[PDB]
Amino acid sequence: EDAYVAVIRPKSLNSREYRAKSYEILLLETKLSEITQGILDYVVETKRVVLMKKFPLDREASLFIVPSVYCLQDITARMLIALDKWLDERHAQSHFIPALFRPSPLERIKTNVINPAYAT
């Protein structure tokens, strides 16, 4: 039900090292069918939506990441350090960060072949 969003953009990307100064951040909140269409409509009103982690409260709040094109080096408390850690690891995976910031399906589709036996 409960949601949170961290929007990030670069100034790299294919880089081997994670530099937090290479990336900037804008956390938003919305409640709840369509999840992918949901968050993306909310962002533009105020590339993809990536569920990272869930955080228990002692009943859990979700953290999503929205890649795009306030500096992170200069910088809710539980979520920021988790994002810094998460990015530190995954930047040392290769193709991961480039895949995170890649264009939309529509910018990438080349051919679409359908079987006429499944029509209407």
Partner: protein, 139 residues
């Protein structure tokens, strides 16, 4: 190029997500997105293994074999293919992937199959022969 109904191609294999219940997966853009999220989650790799396979396309459907032709991995029957989509991986090397959405005889479950082609030209040739197959059996 114009115009054949039976062709073989050297390709690479990213992987498969077999036996999905439903996820509400409509059209080519939902398909590409789903594969993206699978790659992000580590269900599929960003880079395929080096080994090459032979993809034969004909009026039977799509056949995938080892480069030695010795072993057949899969026969994707024409009747059970729902959609094939060719798209750019979007990573830098500009690789072209093919995604096949297939179903089973009773149309109750779906599977996704992802291949990597050596060029965009090859991916388009595969799509052409598949299209021609459909139109041919449709008569």
């Amino acid at each position: 190029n114009n115009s054949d109904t039976c062709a073989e191609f050297r390709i690479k294999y990213v992987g498969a997500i077999e036996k999905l219940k439903l996820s509400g997966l409509e059209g080519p853009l939902d398909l590409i997105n789903y594969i993206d999220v699978a790659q992000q989650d580590g269900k599929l790799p960003f880079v395929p293994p080096e080994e090459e396979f032979i993809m034969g396309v004909s009026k039977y459907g799509i056949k995938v074999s080892t480069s030695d032709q010795y072993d057949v991995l899969h026969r994707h029957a024409l009747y059970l293919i729902i959609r094939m989509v060719c798209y750019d991986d979007g990573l830098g090397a500009g690789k072209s992937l093919l995604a096949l959405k297939t179903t089973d005889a009773s149309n109750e479950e779906y599977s996704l199959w992802v291949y990597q082609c050596n060029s965009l030209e090859q991916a388009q040739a595969i799509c052409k022969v598949l299209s021609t197959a459909f139109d041919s059996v449709l008569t």
